Amino acid sequence: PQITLWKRPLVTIKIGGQLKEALLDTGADDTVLEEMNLPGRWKPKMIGGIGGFIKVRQYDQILIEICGHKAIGTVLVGPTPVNIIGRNLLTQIGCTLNF
């Protein structure tokens, strides 16, 4: 598909058996999801953006389905205001910017 940018590029994702709405974000290196208690090991991390840093839990090799396209990678979980799909997963679904 093609997604115009008049509105936020929000799409449905499937993760850890749950459906959620997330932002396709070319400005995020990594994927940051709202608080959810996913099973398995995790490592503490701090990620910074506008306004400073927040503490997140880094889970590795997490599967996520993004509009029917599967991707497997690192997911950071924490008090993010929005579910953010970053480049680590956008690359796997073949997403590009075009103008």
Which residues are known catalytic residues?
25
Out of 84, 85, 89, 90, the only residue in the binding site for ligand XVP (CB under 6 A) is 84
| Bridge pairing between strands 31-33 and 52-66 | unpaired
Query: Closest separation between CB of residue 26 and ligand XVP, Å?
Result: 7
What binding mask, one character per residue, do residues 10-49 give for a copy of itself by CB under 8 A, x or -?
Answer: -------------xxxxxxx--x--------------xxx
Query: Closest separation between CB of residue 60 and a copy of itself, Å?
Result: 19
Q: Which stretch binds ligand XVP (CB under 6 A): 11-19, 33-41, 61-69, 79-87?
A: 79-87
d(CA 50, CA 69): 30
DSSP code for 38: -
**Type of residue numbered 62:** I
| Structure-token match 């993760």, residue found | 15
d(CA 12, CA 22): 6
